[PDB]
Amino acid sequence: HHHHFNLPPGNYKKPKLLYCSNGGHFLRILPDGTVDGTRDRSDQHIQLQLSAEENGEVYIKSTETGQYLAMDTDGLLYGSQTPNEECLFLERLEENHYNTYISKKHAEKNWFVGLKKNGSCKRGPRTHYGQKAILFLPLPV
């Protein structure tokens, strides 16, 4: 492994909102495949269903559109119509409280799912351990 194995509590039985404290935005996967964040809790594209693959690995899927969260070869998040290697994330506990999501494909490069204070997604190479941008809290829908 390139990363620790402290896993967050909870489960995948119900869909969740992934709340980022950095700017206070919910992760959103828009119908056109765009990914960003919004503070509007009524948004229909922030409901996400997570599911497990191997222990500690997850797929993050839009319940409204069916799209899978994914990070491309240049570190940009996008919504994928089908599940592929870029859609698997390593879900870990961070700072003994939050959830972080590391791109499995680019795990050796420490590329995380992260949102900036202005609600725009961070590009893989611009994320790293220690940032507030990579910290999420799963909330009920």
C-alpha distances (whole Å) from 46 to each of 67, 104, 118, 129 are 12, 22, 17, 24
Burial of residue 13 (number of CB atoms within 10 Å: 0-12, 13-18, 19+): exposed
What does the alpha-carbon distance between residue 100 and residue 97 come to, in Å, rounded to a whole number? 10
Q: CA nearest 27: which of 107, 116, 111?
A: 116
What does the alpha-carbon distance between residue 97 and residue 72 come to, in Å, rounded to a whole number? 28
Q: Where are the domains of the chain?
A: 1-141
Multiple choice CATH, 1-141, 3.40.50.2300, 3.30.70.20, 3.30.1600.10, 2.80.10.50: 2.80.10.50
Any known ligand binding at 55?
no
Strand partners, 84: none
What does the alpha-carbon distance between residue 54 and residue 80 come to, in Å, rounded to a whole number? 20
> Mapping DSSP to helix (H, G, I), strand (E, B) and coil, where does residue 127 land?
coil
